[PDB]
Design a protein around this ligand. Structure first.
Ligand SMILES: Cn1ccc2c(-c3nc4c(-n5cc(N[C@@H]6CCOC[C@@H]6N)cn5)ccnc4[nH]3)cccc21
Length: 269
């Protein structure tokens, strides 16, 4: 869990940043090999958030979730993860506009497999967006960014937030109206992630305020079908955006629909 600072080498340049601080590339020296790593470096509330994020990630073991190597307390608090070299999914698709439809289905199906595992494990992600999916290769995606994640109580199917910055354009109506977060609210966010991927990393609800997004959803309106997106995939996005939590599908149903459609496209090609 606790790593040795003497075995960690950090690069000067930063990969990216957030409200927590920066993300940098590094190397962790093992006995016979060296591990390339991605490190979150903090800029009392942020320290507690990083320790809680590390506590969630250490409990997870799935091919489609980023692996945490450990934590280190040096000049600042650090969260060390296994490196996914190609970076965030939204940026990759903005820079590689020729990625084929079959390849987009493959990647979003991998995200649904990671989420099916998280649902089975009774954890809620609470920040599922394309910026938080990292690419190992052009054909292998992993979920990261567990800073808002929660382990559900044994007697409850949801997490209740006490006081509302939130990524509002990815949040379900019950999150906004009742501050209730469940695996089904993560399904709503997964629908927005699908729209971002098929739109090659474009931002959802372009040019709209948070209050204007609420009014749109209340009228029963939803974002349109991205250019070149198959009807079957747009139908699935719309099912993820079921207003009533009770009638919205869970990740077992979403993953099965994606798996069957992916195989249909593979065997047709
Ligand atoms: C531009 N850029 C931004 C990141 C990145 C990387 C890269 N980040 C990695 C990473 N994590 C990055 C975050 N949080 C950041 C916050 C800023 O927005 C993007 C992410 N959501 C959490 N885990 C885990 C494992 N491997 C990673 N590899 C590689 C190459 C380029 C990169």
């Amino acid at each position: 869990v606790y790593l040795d600072r003497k075995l960690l080498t950090l690069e000067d340049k930063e990969l990216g940043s957030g409200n927590f601080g920066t993300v940098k590339k590094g190397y962790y020296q093992m006995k016979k090999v060296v591990k390339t790593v991605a490190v979150k470096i903090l800029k009392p509330a942020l320290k507690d958030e990083l320790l809680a994020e590390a506590n969630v990630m250490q409990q997870l073991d799935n091919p489609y979730i980023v692996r945490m190597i450990g934590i280190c307390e040096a000049e600042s608090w650090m969260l060390v993860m296994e490196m996914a070299e190609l970076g965030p999914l939204n940026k990759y698709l903005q820079q590689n506009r020729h990625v084929k439809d079959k390849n987009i289905i493959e990647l979003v199906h991998q995200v649904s497999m990671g989420m099916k595992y998280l649902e089975e494990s009774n954890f809620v992600h609470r920040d599922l967006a394309a910026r938080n999916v990292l690419l190992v290769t052009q054909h292998y995606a992993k979920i990261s960014d567990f800073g808002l994640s929660k382990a559900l109580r044994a007697d409850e199917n949801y997490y209740k937030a006490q006081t509302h910055k939130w990524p509002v354009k990815w949040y379900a109506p019950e999150c906004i109206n009742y501050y209730k977060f469940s695996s089904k609210s993560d399904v709503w966010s997964f629908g927005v992630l699908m729209w971002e991927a098929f739109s090659y990393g474009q931002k959802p609800y372009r040019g709209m305020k948070g209050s204007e997004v609420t009014a749109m959803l209340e009228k029963g309106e939803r974002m349109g079908c991205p250019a070149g997106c198959p009807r079957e995939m747009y139908d699935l996005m719309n099912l993820c955006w079921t207003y009533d939590v009770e009638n919205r599908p869970g990740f077992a149903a979403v993953e099965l629909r994606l798996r069957n459609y992916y195989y249909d496209v593979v065997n047709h090609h």
